[PDB]
CSV table of C-alpha atoms in Angstrom, one decimal:
chain,number,residue,atom,x,y,z
E,4,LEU,CA,79.7,-7.3,66.1
E,5,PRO,CA,83.3,-6.3,65.5
E,6,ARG,CA,85.6,-9.1,64.4
E,7,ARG,CA,87.9,-8.3,67.4
E,8,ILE,CA,85.2,-9.3,69.9
E,9,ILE,CA,84.5,-12.5,68.0
E,10,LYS,CA,88.2,-13.4,68.2
E,11,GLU,CA,88.7,-12.5,71.8
E,12,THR,CA,85.6,-14.6,72.8
E,13,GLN,CA,86.9,-17.6,70.9
E,14,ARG,CA,90.4,-17.4,72.4
E,15,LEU,CA,89.0,-17.0,76.0
E,16,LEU,CA,87.0,-20.2,75.5
E,17,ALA,CA,89.7,-22.1,73.7
E,18,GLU,CA,92.5,-21.0,76.0
E,19,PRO,CA,91.0,-20.0,79.4
E,20,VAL,CA,93.0,-18.1,82.0
E,21,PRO,CA,94.0,-20.5,84.8
E,22,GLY,CA,91.7,-20.0,87.7
E,23,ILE,CA,89.2,-18.0,85.7
E,24,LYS,CA,86.0,-19.0,83.9
E,25,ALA,CA,84.7,-16.5,81.4
E,26,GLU,CA,81.9,-17.1,78.9
E,27,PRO,CA,79.7,-14.9,76.8
E,28,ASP,CA,76.1,-14.4,77.7
E,29,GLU,CA,73.7,-16.4,75.4
E,30,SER,CA,71.7,-13.2,74.5
E,31,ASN,CA,74.4,-10.5,74.5
E,32,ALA,CA,77.8,-11.1,72.8
E,33,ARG,CA,79.2,-8.1,74.6
E,34,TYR,CA,78.3,-9.4,78.1
E,35,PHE,CA,80.5,-11.9,79.9
E,36,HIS,CA,79.9,-14.1,83.0
E,37,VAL,CA,83.1,-14.6,84.9
E,38,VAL,CA,84.1,-16.7,87.9
E,39,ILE,CA,87.5,-16.1,89.5
E,40,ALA,CA,88.9,-18.5,92.1
E,41,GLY,CA,90.3,-17.0,95.2
E,42,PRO,CA,94.1,-17.2,94.8
E,43,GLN,CA,96.1,-19.6,96.9
E,44,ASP,CA,97.7,-18.0,100.0
E,45,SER,CA,95.4,-15.0,99.6
E,46,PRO,CA,92.7,-13.9,102.0
E,47,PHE,CA,90.2,-15.2,99.4
E,48,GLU,CA,91.6,-18.7,99.0
E,49,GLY,CA,88.7,-21.2,98.9
E,50,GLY,CA,86.3,-18.7,97.4
E,51,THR,CA,84.6,-18.6,94.0
E,52,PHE,CA,83.8,-15.0,93.0
E,53,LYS,CA,81.3,-14.1,90.3
E,54,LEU,CA,82.0,-11.0,88.2
E,55,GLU,CA,80.3,-9.6,85.1
E,56,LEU,CA,82.1,-7.8,82.2
E,57,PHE,CA,80.5,-5.6,79.5
E,58,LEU,CA,82.1,-4.3,76.3
E,59,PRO,CA,80.7,-0.8,75.7
E,60,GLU,CA,80.0,0.5,72.2
E,61,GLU,CA,83.4,2.2,71.9
E,62,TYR,CA,85.4,-0.9,72.9
E,63,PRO,CA,88.4,-1.3,72.4
E,64,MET,CA,89.0,2.5,72.5
E,65,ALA,CA,87.0,2.4,75.8
E,66,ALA,CA,87.7,0.0,78.6
E,67,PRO,CA,85.5,-2.9,79.5
E,68,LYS,CA,83.2,-2.3,82.4
E,69,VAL,CA,83.5,-4.9,85.1
E,70,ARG,CA,81.9,-5.5,88.5
E,71,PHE,CA,82.0,-8.1,91.2
E,72,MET,CA,78.6,-9.8,91.8
E,73,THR,CA,79.9,-11.7,94.9
E,74,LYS,CA,80.3,-9.5,97.9
E,75,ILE,CA,84.0,-9.2,98.8
E,76,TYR,CA,86.1,-7.3,101.4
E,77,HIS,CA,88.9,-5.8,99.4
E,78,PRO,CA,90.5,-2.3,99.3
E,79,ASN,CA,89.8,-1.9,95.6
E,80,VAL,CA,86.1,-3.1,95.6
E,81,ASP,CA,83.2,-1.2,97.0
E,82,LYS,CA,79.9,-2.3,98.5
E,83,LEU,CA,78.2,-2.6,95.0
E,84,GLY,CA,81.1,-4.6,93.6
E,85,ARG,CA,82.7,-1.7,91.6
E,86,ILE,CA,86.4,-2.1,91.0
E,87,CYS,CA,89.1,0.6,91.4
E,88,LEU,CA,91.7,-0.3,88.8
E,89,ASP,CA,93.9,1.9,86.6
E,90,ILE,CA,93.3,0.0,83.3
E,91,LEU,CA,89.6,0.3,83.8
E,92,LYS,CA,89.8,4.1,84.0
E,93,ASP,CA,92.5,6.2,82.4
E,94,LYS,CA,95.3,3.6,81.9
E,95,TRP,CA,93.3,1.6,79.4
E,96,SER,CA,94.9,1.0,76.0
E,97,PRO,CA,93.3,-0.7,73.0
E,98,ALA,CA,96.5,-2.9,72.9
E,99,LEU,CA,95.1,-4.5,76.1
E,100,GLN,CA,92.2,-6.9,76.1
E,101,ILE,CA,89.6,-8.8,78.2
E,102,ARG,CA,92.3,-11.3,79.2
E,103,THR,CA,94.4,-8.5,80.6
E,104,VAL,CA,91.5,-7.2,82.7
E,105,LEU,CA,90.8,-10.6,84.1
E,106,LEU,CA,94.5,-11.3,84.9
E,107,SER,CA,94.7,-7.8,86.6
E,108,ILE,CA,91.7,-8.5,88.8
E,109,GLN,CA,93.0,-11.9,89.7
E,110,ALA,CA,96.3,-10.2,90.7
E,111,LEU,CA,94.4,-7.7,92.9
E,112,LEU,CA,93.0,-10.6,94.9
E,113,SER,CA,96.5,-12.2,95.3
E,114,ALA,CA,98.1,-8.9,96.4
E,115,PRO,CA,95.7,-6.5,98.1
E,116,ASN,CA,97.5,-3.2,98.5
E,117,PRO,CA,95.4,-0.6,100.4
E,118,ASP,CA,97.8,2.2,99.3
E,119,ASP,CA,96.9,1.6,95.6
E,120,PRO,CA,93.2,2.5,95.2
E,121,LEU,CA,91.6,5.9,95.9
E,122,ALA,CA,91.1,6.3,99.6
E,123,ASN,CA,88.1,4.6,101.1
E,124,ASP,CA,86.9,3.0,104.4
E,125,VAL,CA,87.9,-0.6,103.5
E,126,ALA,CA,91.4,0.5,102.4
E,127,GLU,CA,91.8,2.5,105.6
E,128,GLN,CA,91.0,-0.7,107.7
E,129,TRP,CA,93.5,-2.7,105.6
E,130,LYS,CA,96.1,0.0,106.3
E,131,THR,CA,95.6,0.5,110.0
E,132,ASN,CA,94.2,-2.9,111.2
E,133,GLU,CA,95.5,-5.3,108.6
E,134,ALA,CA,95.0,-8.4,110.7
E,135,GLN,CA,91.4,-7.7,111.3
E,136,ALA,CA,90.9,-6.7,107.7
E,137,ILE,CA,92.3,-10.1,106.5
E,138,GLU,CA,90.0,-12.0,108.9
E,139,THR,CA,87.0,-10.0,107.6
E,140,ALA,CA,88.1,-10.9,104.0
E,141,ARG,CA,88.3,-14.6,105.0
E,142,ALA,CA,85.0,-14.5,106.9
E,143,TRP,CA,83.2,-12.9,103.9
E,144,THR,CA,84.9,-15.5,101.6
E,145,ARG,CA,83.2,-18.3,103.7
E,146,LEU,CA,79.9,-16.5,103.9
E,147,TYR,CA,79.5,-15.2,100.3
E,148,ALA,CA,82.0,-17.0,98.1
E,149,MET,CA,81.5,-20.7,99.0
E,150,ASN,CA,78.6,-22.8,97.8
E,151,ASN,CA,77.5,-19.7,95.7
Y,6,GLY,CA,72.0,-2.4,68.5
Y,7,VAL,CA,74.3,-2.4,71.5
Y,8,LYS,CA,72.3,-3.7,74.5
Y,9,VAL,CA,73.4,-2.6,78.0
Y,10,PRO,CA,72.8,-5.4,80.5
Y,11,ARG,CA,70.6,-4.8,83.5
Y,12,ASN,CA,73.3,-4.4,86.1
Y,13,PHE,CA,75.3,-1.9,84.1
Y,14,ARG,CA,72.2,0.0,83.2
Y,15,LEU,CA,71.2,0.2,86.9
Y,16,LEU,CA,74.7,1.5,87.8
Y,17,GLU,CA,74.1,4.2,85.2
Y,18,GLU,CA,70.8,5.0,86.8
Y,19,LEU,CA,72.5,5.0,90.2
Y,20,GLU,CA,75.0,7.7,89.1
Y,21,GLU,CA,72.2,9.7,87.4
Y,22,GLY,CA,70.2,9.6,90.6
Y,23,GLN,CA,73.1,11.0,92.5
Y,24,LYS,CA,73.8,13.8,90.0
Y,25,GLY,CA,70.1,14.6,89.6
Y,26,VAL,CA,68.1,15.2,86.4
Y,27,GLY,CA,66.2,18.2,85.1
Y,28,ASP,CA,64.6,20.4,87.8
Y,29,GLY,CA,64.9,17.8,90.5
Y,30,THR,CA,61.1,17.3,91.0
Y,31,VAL,CA,61.6,13.6,90.9
Y,32,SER,CA,64.6,11.8,92.5
Y,33,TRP,CA,65.7,8.3,93.2
Y,34,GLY,CA,68.4,6.3,94.9
Y,35,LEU,CA,69.2,2.8,96.0
Y,36,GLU,CA,67.2,1.7,99.0
Y,37,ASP,CA,70.0,-0.3,100.6
Y,38,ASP,CA,73.6,0.8,99.8
Y,39,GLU,CA,74.8,-2.9,100.2
Y,40,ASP,CA,72.2,-4.3,97.7
Y,41,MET,CA,74.5,-5.7,95.0
Y,42,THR,CA,71.5,-6.9,93.1
Y,43,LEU,CA,70.4,-3.2,92.6
Y,44,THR,CA,66.8,-4.3,92.9
Y,45,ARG,CA,65.1,-2.0,95.4
Y,46,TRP,CA,65.0,1.7,94.9
Y,47,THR,CA,63.6,4.7,96.7
Y,48,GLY,CA,61.6,7.1,94.6
Y,49,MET,CA,60.5,10.7,95.3
Y,50,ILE,CA,58.0,12.9,93.6
Y,51,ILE,CA,57.3,16.5,94.3
Y,52,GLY,CA,53.6,17.2,93.8
Y,53,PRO,CA,53.1,19.5,90.8
Y,54,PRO,CA,51.9,23.1,91.4
Y,55,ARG,CA,48.3,24.2,90.9
Y,56,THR,CA,47.1,20.7,91.9
Y,57,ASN,CA,45.9,19.2,95.1
Y,58,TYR,CA,49.3,17.5,95.3
Y,59,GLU,CA,51.2,20.8,95.4
Y,60,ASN,CA,53.7,21.3,98.2
Y,61,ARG,CA,53.6,17.6,99.0
Y,62,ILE,CA,56.5,15.1,98.9
Y,63,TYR,CA,55.7,11.5,97.9
Y,64,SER,CA,58.0,8.6,98.7
Y,65,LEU,CA,57.8,5.4,96.6
Y,66,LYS,CA,59.4,2.0,96.3
Y,67,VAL,CA,60.5,0.9,92.9
Y,68,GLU,CA,61.6,-2.7,92.3
Y,69,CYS,CA,63.6,-3.5,89.2
Y,70,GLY,CA,63.4,-7.3,88.7
Y,71,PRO,CA,65.6,-9.7,86.9
Y,72,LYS,CA,64.1,-8.8,83.5
Y,73,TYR,CA,64.4,-5.1,83.9
Y,74,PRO,CA,64.7,-3.0,81.7
Y,75,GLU,CA,63.1,-5.3,79.1
Y,76,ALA,CA,60.3,-5.5,81.7
Y,77,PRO,CA,58.9,-2.6,83.7
Y,78,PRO,CA,59.7,-2.1,87.3
Y,79,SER,CA,57.0,-2.5,90.0
Y,80,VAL,CA,56.1,0.7,91.7
Y,81,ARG,CA,54.2,1.5,94.9
Y,82,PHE,CA,53.6,4.6,96.9
Y,83,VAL,CA,54.7,4.7,100.5
Y,84,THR,CA,53.2,8.1,101.1
Y,85,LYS,CA,49.4,8.0,100.9
Y,86,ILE,CA,47.9,9.6,97.8
Y,87,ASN,CA,44.5,9.7,96.2
Y,88,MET,CA,45.4,9.2,92.5
Y,89,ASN,CA,43.8,7.0,89.7
Y,90,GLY,CA,45.8,3.8,89.3
Y,91,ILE,CA,47.2,3.8,92.9
Y,92,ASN,CA,45.6,1.1,95.0
Y,93,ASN,CA,43.8,2.4,98.1
Y,94,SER,CA,44.8,-0.5,100.4
Y,95,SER,CA,48.4,-1.2,99.3
Y,96,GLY,CA,49.7,1.9,97.4
Y,97,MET,CA,50.6,-0.4,94.5
Y,98,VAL,CA,50.6,1.3,91.1
Y,99,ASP,CA,48.5,-0.5,88.5
Y,100,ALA,CA,50.6,-0.8,85.4
Y,101,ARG,CA,47.5,-0.9,83.2
Y,102,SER,CA,46.6,2.6,84.3
Y,103,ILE,CA,50.0,4.3,83.6
Y,104,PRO,CA,50.8,4.4,79.8
Y,105,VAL,CA,54.5,4.1,80.2
Y,106,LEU,CA,54.1,1.0,82.3
Y,107,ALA,CA,51.3,-0.5,80.2
Y,108,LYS,CA,53.3,0.2,77.0
Y,109,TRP,CA,56.8,-0.3,78.5
Y,110,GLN,CA,59.8,0.2,76.3
Y,111,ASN,CA,63.4,-0.9,77.2
Y,112,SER,CA,64.5,2.7,76.7
Y,113,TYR,CA,62.6,3.7,79.8
Y,114,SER,CA,64.0,4.0,83.3
Y,115,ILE,CA,63.2,4.7,86.9
Y,116,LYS,CA,63.4,8.4,86.0
Y,117,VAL,CA,60.8,8.0,83.3
Y,118,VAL,CA,58.3,6.2,85.6
Y,119,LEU,CA,58.5,8.9,88.3
Y,120,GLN,CA,58.3,11.7,85.7
Y,121,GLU,CA,55.2,10.1,84.2
Y,122,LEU,CA,53.5,9.6,87.5
Y,123,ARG,CA,54.2,13.3,88.3
Y,124,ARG,CA,52.8,14.3,84.9
Y,125,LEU,CA,49.6,12.3,85.6
Y,126,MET,CA,49.1,14.2,88.8
Y,127,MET,CA,48.3,17.2,86.6
Y,128,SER,CA,45.6,15.3,84.7
Y,129,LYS,CA,42.0,16.6,85.1
Y,130,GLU,CA,40.9,13.3,86.8
Y,131,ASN,CA,43.5,13.6,89.5
Y,132,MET,CA,44.5,17.2,90.1
Y,133,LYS,CA,41.3,18.0,92.1
Y,134,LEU,CA,40.9,14.8,94.1
Y,135,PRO,CA,40.7,15.8,97.8
Y,136,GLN,CA,43.8,14.3,99.4
Y,137,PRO,CA,44.4,12.6,102.8
Y,138,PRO,CA,46.1,14.7,105.5
Y,139,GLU,CA,49.9,14.5,105.3
Y,140,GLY,CA,51.7,12.0,107.4
Y,141,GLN,CA,50.0,8.8,106.4
Y,142,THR,CA,51.7,5.7,104.8
Y,143,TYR,CA,50.6,2.4,103.5
Y,144,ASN,CA,51.5,-0.9,105.3
Y,145,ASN,CA,54.5,-3.0,104.3
């Protein structure tokens, strides 16, 4: 295991990101179990969202892989929890780190922008019927991200 | 030894299923496109030529449980088939009868299971079994 992963893990546990729990899996030091609280004043407020993060073999030259495990209605997240985010694809840099990814996903929840991700059905609803889209996000927060 | 966790492995198998592999004579995909647990898969096998399975398409259900891929998936035919190791009442595949399931390794995948089942359709003890008419399925 590279020394960098050891250090990042230790710092995430010793200095957690506000509103985010992130702990390594007992059997796989490259696998992280994550919980992000729905940001205040966002459509996800009140929810607790599970995510999983994996450091592939070429980390940190390659980006972490991250997915929502809690169903969520969001322009940047698909039906299987996959996340559209620049630093997860071609804007990754080894000078960034796990903490950056978690902060960036948290920021996505606080400021959903349907013009940002590659075009998709959820983003189209957020663009054209924003009020209904926000109510769907709130409804799914109650149904899937409370008592979960 | 970099171990890929179940859910990320299954997302790789999802993408591979969409791109297809080899000659396409086995294919797979997620059964429900909202299934975030990635548990239930649709499998397809094309019966191999010069056997009594030739020119027949078989649909299967493949279940990747919480311990997959350290543990094998469960597999059952939906399309009826006369084949050693396939239960006559349920369509369930008996893991003990399929070497890659009986001797499962974590390098295996949905693809491997389906390829192996298709290979075994060519075996002497299966290839000449008289088959049901097409159009029959098992219950559940």
